[PDB]
C-alpha cells in the first residue's frame, strides 16, 4: 500500500542522489496536506522519496491538491474545496482543532492559522476563510497508524514508520489493543483481504474456496490463496472468517489476509512488557524475551524459498534431468522419484539434491591415478558432469511444491531451454537471539537473551512478563509515547469502570459516554492528533478493575511490585509494567550469518568473490589497512593481502601446510600487481622492476 502511494524524485529526468544538496531534502511549508514530512528513508535517499498524504489528490495537470472547508463570517460551512499550493497561498487556512459551536461559529476569538509563507500565526475569527478537514491531514497512511504520535520526536516517528513497513506475517495474527483507527481502511484498500462483492448468504465455506449466494440469484465463488510465496519470501495465505448460513453485505470482509485479523491490519503481537534494567542482558538497546513466546509459537513466521533449474541444449550435447548422478553414494538418491526430482513432503538439509541434472562433458584426459582407481573398483568413467540443483549453504526446510515445464508438452519456454523445474521449500522460523524486534515508536533492538519462564520477573499474581525493555534508552530519544501506549495497553487488557457516583469525575468531563466502562480484552482507538490525553490516561489507570482474585496488580501510577525469578526476593521498587504491541522485523540472523574458508574466485584478478549468495569473502578495505599499520602488525597485514587474496601458489601451499601440520610458507607476489603492470604496459608505459644490480626482473615465472 505504501509502495503504490510513493513519490520519488529520482529517475530519468529527475535528480540524482549525489547531485542534490541540502535544499531539496527539506520540508517545504507547501507540503502540508500533500506530502508526509515524517515518512522518508533515513539512508542516503532522505528527502528524495516521500509518501502521499491521506486526503491528497492529483490535479489533471499533475499538481497535488488537498481539501479544505470553506468558512464565512466565522461560520464553518460544509462545502469542501480542493486547493493546490498556489491557491492555498492566497487564502489563510485555520486549524481543524479550532473549537466550533453547534452551527460553526468560533467560540474563541483568537484562532491559529497559517499565512502565505507558512507563518503560523494568531488572527481574529473574521480573517479566516478556510479550515482543515481532519487533524491528521498532514500524515500518510503509515504515519497515521502510530498511536500517540505527537508525543514522539520526528526522528523516532520516521524510524517507527519505516520499521512498521518491514514487519513479517506471523502464523497467527492479532490486532493491537490500542490503535489509531487507520486499520480497517488500510487493510481493505491494501487488497490482500477478500471482500464480498454482492450481498447474500454463504453456502459452502472451506479452506480454499467460498461460495456466496445473492438475493439476485447469482453464485459468486472466491478462491483463497494458500501458502503462496510473496516477492520477499514471506508466506501469504488467506483464511475465511465466515460460516455457512451467515448473511453478508456488499463490501463486508469475507476472508483475512496475511497480516489481517477480522479485516484490521495486525502487524505484530501484544506482549506484557516491564521497563527495567536486568543484569545487563538488555544493555545498549538489547531485548530480553520469555521462553513462552518460543513454546507457544507467538513470534513464529513461515518463509518460502524457490529454486529453479533448467535443462537447455548445449553445443556438446543435451542436458538431461535424471537420477543417474555418476559419482555419488546410494543414500543421496533416496528422496528422488523416478523422474529425478525430490518428493513432496521430504525434508531437505544443506547440500541435499533437489533436482538431478547432468550435462555432456566431452573428451577429457583423466589422471593416471584416477584411471587406475576406476580400473580397480570398476566404476567406468562416463562423459557426463553432475550439475544437480542442491540446497544452498545454511538453508533447510520441507518441500511443499514442484512445478515442471517441458517443451514437448507445448510450454512457452525461451529459446534453447528444453526443460524447467521449480521447487518450493517452506520453513517455520521461531524467534531467536539476533532477530530484530521493534515497536511503532521507533524503538528497535535485537534479542540478546531468551530466559526460561521461571527466570522472568512476575507479578504478585504469578504472571510472568513477556519482554523486558531497558530504561536508559527511553528518555534520551524523546519517544515516550510508547510509555503512554504501555499504560493504555494495560487498561485495554484490564477493563475499566469509571465511578459515576456523585456525578461525572472532573477529569472525565470530555470522555464520550461509551468510554465510561469497558470489559476485559477490549480494544480502544487513539487517533493520531486527537486521542487520549494525559489526565484521561491517569484517570483510567486509577479506574481499572481487579483480576480474578479481586486485587489490583498495577496502581494508579502504572507500576507494579515484581518478584525476582531467579532469587525470589521482590525488587525494592515498583516497576512500570503494561502491554506493548511489538513487531517482528525482517532482519533475521539466519539470513545474516556467513563464513568461508575457501571458495570461488574472480577471473581477471584472482580474488575471492563477495556476497553470501556466492560464498564470498569479507572485504579488508583501506581503513582496515590503516588500522593494521597503526597497530604495527606488519605480518598480519602482509598475509591478509598476499596469501588470503591473490597469491595463487600461496593459497594452495597454505592449505596444504595447514592440513599436513607444517609451518605457513612465505608469501609471494599478488596477482593484482601483475595485472596492474600489464595494464600500464598496454598504455605505452615502460614499467620495469629493477633488481639491486640494475637489471630487469621478468614477471613470467612459471
Amino acid at each position: 500500500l505504501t509502495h503504490k502511494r510513493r513519490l520519488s524524485a529520482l529517475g530519468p529526468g529527475g535528480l540524482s542522489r549525489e547531485r542534490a544538496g541540502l535544499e531539496v531534502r527539506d520540508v517545504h511549508p507547501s507540503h502540508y496536506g500533500r506530502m508526509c514530512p515524517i515518512e522518508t528513508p533515513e539512508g542516503p535517499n532522505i528527502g528524495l522519496i516521500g509518501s502521499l498524504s491521506v486526503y491528497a489528490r492529483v490535479n489533471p495537470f499533475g499538481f497535488i491538491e488537498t481539501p479544505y472547508r470553506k468558512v464565512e463570517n466565522g461560520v464553518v460551512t460544509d462545502q469542501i474545496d480542493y486547493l493546490t499550493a498556489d491557491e492555498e497561498d492566497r487564502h489563510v487556512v485555520a486549524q481543524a482543532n479550532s473549537p466550533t459551536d453547534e452551527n460553526g461559529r468560533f467560540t474563541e476569538d483568537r484562532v491559529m492559522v497559517r499565512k502565505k509563507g507558512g507563518e503560523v500565526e494568531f488572527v481574529s475569527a473574521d480573517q479566516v476563510d478556510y479550515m482543515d478537514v481532519s487533524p491528521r491531514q498532514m500524515v500518510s497512511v503509515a504515519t497515521a497508524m502510530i498511536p500517540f504520535l505527537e508525543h514522539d520526536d520526528a526522528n523516532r516517528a520516521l524510524m517507527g514508520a519505516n520499521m512498521q513497513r518491514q514487519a513479517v506475517p506471523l502464523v497467527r495474527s492479532e490486532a493491537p489493543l490500542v490503535g489509531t483507527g487507520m486499520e480497517l481502511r488500510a487493510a481493505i484498500d491494501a487488497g490482500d483481504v477478500v471482500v464480498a462483492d454482492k450481498t447474500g448468504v454463504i453456502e459452502e465455506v472451506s479452506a480454499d474456496y467460498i461460495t456466496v449466494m445473492a438475493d439476485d440469484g447469482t453464485r459468486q465463488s472466491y478462491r483463497l490463496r494458500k501458502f503462496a510465496r510473496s516477492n520477499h519470501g514471506t508466506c501469504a495465505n488467506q483464511r475465511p472468517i465466515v460460516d455457512a448460513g451467515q448473511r453478508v453485505e456488499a463490501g463486508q470482509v469475507i476472508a483475512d489476509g496475511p497480516c489481517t485479523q477480522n479485516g484490521e491490519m495486525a502487524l505484530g503481537k501484544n506482549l506484557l512488557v516491564a521497563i527495567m534494567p536486568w543484569e545487563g542482558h538488555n544493555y545498549e538497546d538489547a531485548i530480553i524475551l520469555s521462553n513462552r513466546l518460543v513454546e507457544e509459537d507467538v513470534l513464529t513466521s513461515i518463509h518460502i524459498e524457490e529454486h529453479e533449474i533448467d535443462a537447455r541444449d548445449t553445443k556438446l550435447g543435451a542436458e538431461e534431468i535424471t537420477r543417474d548422478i555418476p559419482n555419488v553414494s546410494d543414500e543421496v538418491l533416496a528422496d528422488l522419484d523416478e523422474r529425478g526430482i525430490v518428493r513432496i513432503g521430504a525434508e531437505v538439509r544443506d547440500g541435499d539434491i533437489l533436482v538431478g541434472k547432468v550435462t555432456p562433458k566431452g573428451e577429457t584426459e583423466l589422471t593416471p591415478e584416477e584411471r587406475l582407481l576406476r580400473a580397480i573398483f570398476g566404476e567406468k568413467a562416463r562423459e557426463v558432469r553432475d550439475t544437480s540443483l542442491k540446497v544452498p549453504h545454511g538453508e533447510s526446510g520441507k518441500v511443499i511444491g514442484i512445478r515442471v515445464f517441458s517443451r514437448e508438452d507445448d510450454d512457452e519456454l525461451p529459446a534453447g531451454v528444453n526443460e524447467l523445474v521449480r521447487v518450493y521449500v517452506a520453513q517455520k522460523r521461531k524467534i531467536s537471539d539476533g532477530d530484530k524486534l521493534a515497536g511503532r515508536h521507533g524503538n528497535k533492538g535485537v534479542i540478546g537473551k531468551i530466559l526460561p519462564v521461571e527466570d522472568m520477573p512476575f507479578l504478585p499474581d504469578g504472571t510472568p512478563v513477556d519482554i523486558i525493555l531497558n530504561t536508559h534508552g527511553v528518555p534520551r530519544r524523546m519517544n515516550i509515547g510508547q510509555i503512554l501506549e504501555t499504560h493504555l495497553g494495560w487498561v485495554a487488557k484490564a477493563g475499566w469502570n469509571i465511578d459515576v457516583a456523585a456525578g461525572v469525575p472532573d477529569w472525565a468531563s470530555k470522555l464520550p459516554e461509551e468510554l465510561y466502562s469497558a470489559p476485559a480484552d477490549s480494544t480502544v482507538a487513539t487517533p493520531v492528533f486527537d486521542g487520549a490525553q494525559e489526565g484521561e490516561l491517569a484517570g483510567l489507570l486509577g479506574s481499572t478493575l481487579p483480576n480474578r482474585d479481586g486485587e489490583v496488580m498495577v496502581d494508579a501510577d502504572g507500576k507494579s511490585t515484581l518478584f525476582d525469578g531467579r532469587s525470589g526476593e521482590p525488587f525494592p521498587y515498583p516497576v512500570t509494567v503494561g502491554y506493548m504491541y511489538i513487531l517482528k522485523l525482517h532482519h533475521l540472523v539466519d539470513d545474516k550469518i556467513h563464513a568461508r574458508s575457501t571458495g570461488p574466485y574472480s577471473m581477471i584478478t584472482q580474488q575471492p568473490l563477495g556476497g553470501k549468495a556466492q560464498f564470498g569473502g569479507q572485504r579488508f578495505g583501506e581503513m582496515e589497512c590503516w588500522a593494521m599499520q597503526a597497530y604495527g602488525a606488519a605480518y598480519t597485514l602482509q598475509e591478509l593481502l598476499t596469501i588470503k587474496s591473490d597469491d595463487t601458489v600461496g593459497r594452495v601451499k597454505v592449505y596444504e601446510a595447514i592440513v599436513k601440520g607444517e609451518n605457513i610458507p612465505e608469501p609471494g607476489i599478488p596477482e593484482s600487481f601483475k595485472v596492474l603492470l600489464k595494464e600500464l604496459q598496454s598504455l605505452c608505459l615502460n614499467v620495469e622492476v629493477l633488481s639491486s644490480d640494475g637489471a630487469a626482473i621478468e614477471m613470467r615465472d612459471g
Binding site: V171, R172, E204, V205, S206, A207, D208, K226, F227, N237, R239, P240, A244, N291, V294, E295, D297, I302, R343, I344, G345, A346, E347, R349, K398, V399, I400, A426, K428, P452, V453, E454, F458, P460, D461, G462, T463, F563, D564, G565, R566, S567, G568, E569, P570
Partner: protein, 225 residues
C-alpha cells in the same frame, strides 16, 4: 530459640487450584523456599503430550484438507492445546475419525486403555458435507519443553508430521509471606503458596513431585561430604 518445627497445611480454592501454608519459618526464609518450589513446579514436573500426528491425505504441514475450514497448521495449533494423561512410558497411538458436517472436537478422540483426555470440548476443526477428517496422534511422556524431532532422526516416513510437545502440567504458581508468626519474638515468616494446574494432575501431586526432586538434590548436597 524455637523448638517448634514447621508444618504444612492445604486449603482448596477450586478443582485445579490449591493453597498451601507453611509455618513457622525463620525471618527472611519464606521467599527463597517459595521461589525454589515455584521453579521446580514450573520446570521439572513430568507429564504427557502428543509428539506426532499423521493425517490421511496430507504429506506435510503446509497444506489443506478438502472440506475442512482450517488448514493443517491451524489444526496443529488447536491440537497443541490438548491436556492428556498417560500411564504408559512408551509411546501410544490415538485415533480420531469423523465424516460429514459437524464440529470435530477433542471428545471425538477415542484413546486406548490408559490414556485420557481431560477437555472433551475444545475446538479442533469444522467439516462441511464434503469434509472427512482422519488423523492418528502419538502420545509420549516427558518433562519440560521439547521441540519437534525431525523425521531424518527417527527414520520416519513422509506423511508423519512432528509436533512440538509441552509436557508441563502446571499453569500458575505464586507465593506470599506474612512475617506474622509469634512465639516469643514477632519476626517469624509464614509462607502461602498458590498452585494451579492443567487438571491433568492435582496440585498436591505436583507439590509432592517438586518436594521429592528438591529432597533428592539437597540430600546429595549433604551426603557427599
Amino acid at each position: 530459640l524455637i523448638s517448634q518445627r514447621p508444618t504444612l497445611s492445604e486449603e482448596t480454592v477450586a478443582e485445579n487450584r490449591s493453597r498451601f501454608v507453611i509455618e513457622p519459618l525463620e525471618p527472611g526464609f519464606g521467599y527463597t523456599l517459595g521461589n525454589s518450589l515455584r521453579r521446580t513446579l514450573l520446570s521439572s514436573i513430568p507429564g504427557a503430550a502428543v509428539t506426532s500426528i499423521r493425517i490421511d491425505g496430507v504429506l506435510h504441514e503446509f497444506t489443506t484438507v478438502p472440506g475442512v475450514k482450517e488448514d493443517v497448521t491451524d489444526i496443529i495449533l488447536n491440537l497443541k492445546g490438548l491436556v492428556v494423561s498417560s500411564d504408559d512410558d512408551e509411546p501410544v497411538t490415538m485415533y480420531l475419525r469423523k465424516q460429514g458436517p459437524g464440529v470435530v472436537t477433542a471428545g471425538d478422540i477415542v484413546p486406548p486403555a490408559g490414556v485420557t483426555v481431560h477437555n472433551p470440548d475444545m475446538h479442533i476443526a469444522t467439516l462441511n458435507d464434503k469434509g472427512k477428517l482422519e488423523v492418528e496422534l502419538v502420545v509420549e511422556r516427558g518433562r519440560g519443553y521439547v521441540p519437534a524431532v525431525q523425521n531424518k532422526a527417527s527414520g520416519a516416513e513422509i506423511g508423519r508430521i512432528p509436533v512440538d510437545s509441552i509436557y508441563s502440567p502446571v499453569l500458575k504458581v505464586t507465593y506470599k509471606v506474612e512475617a506474622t508468626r509469634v512465639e516469643q519474638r514477632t519476626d517469624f515468616d509464614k509462607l502461602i503458596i498458590d498452585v494451579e494446574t492443567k487438571n491433568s494432575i492435582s496440585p498436591r501431586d505436583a507439590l509432592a513431585s517438586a518436594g521429592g526432586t528438591l529432597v533428592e538434590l539437597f540430600g546429595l548436597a549433604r551426603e557427599l561430604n
